[PDB]
């Protein structure tokens, strides 16, 4: 029916899906963190 509310907040889910440990577990996430550091993002991970 009505859409737009696909984001149901959940801190545990957010930290597990997007987090420092999750990024550093795999080499791809390390590359993502490296790209964010190179660009200069204030927030590198959720």
């Amino acid at each position: 029916k009505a859409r737009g509310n696909e984001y149901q907040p959940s801190n545990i889910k957010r930290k597990n899906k997007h987090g420092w440990v999750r990024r550093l577990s795999t080499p791809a996430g390390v590359q993502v963190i490296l790209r964010r550091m190179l660009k200069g993002r204030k927030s590198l991970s959720h």
Partner: protein, 124 residues
């Protein structure tokens, strides 16, 4: 939809997240069955406050105190002030030996001491 810029504190998240996070206070004990906390007196820091009766020093210094040269304390200066007189005296008297530096004040190993310079096992 979450503020990534804000600092992640113990006030955010579910009950487990809020309870597993602290503000930086050092632990003074441990948990046991029944979620029962046992406190360790030795782990609890003990303040050392001296007696301030008859202490002539005051928080401020009068502006009439003359200016003095600034000389930061160095290892060589400390050795000259403390160990050099005794070493020179023993050398002149002939009693000097290269095996009693510990007698002169040297510490071979910090192990076995309550206060160890390296690694520092004592608080300020």
């Amino acid at each position: 939809g979450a503020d990534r810029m804000s600092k992640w504190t113990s006030k955010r998240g579910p009950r487990s997240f809020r309870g597993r996070k602290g503000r930086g206070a050092k632990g003074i004990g441990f948990l046991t069955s029944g979620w029962r906390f046992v406190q360790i007196k030795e782990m609890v820091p003990e303040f050392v406050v001296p007696d301030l009766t008859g202490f002539k020093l005051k928080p401020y210094v009068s502006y009439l105190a003359p200016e003095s040269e600034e000389t930061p304390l160095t290892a060589a200066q400390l050795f000259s002030e403390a160990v050099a007189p005794a070493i020179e005296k023993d050398f002149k008297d002939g009693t000097f030996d290269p095996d009693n530096l510990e007698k002169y004040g040297f510490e071979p190993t910090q192990e076995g001491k309550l206060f160890q310079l390296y690694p520092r096992n004592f608080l300020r």
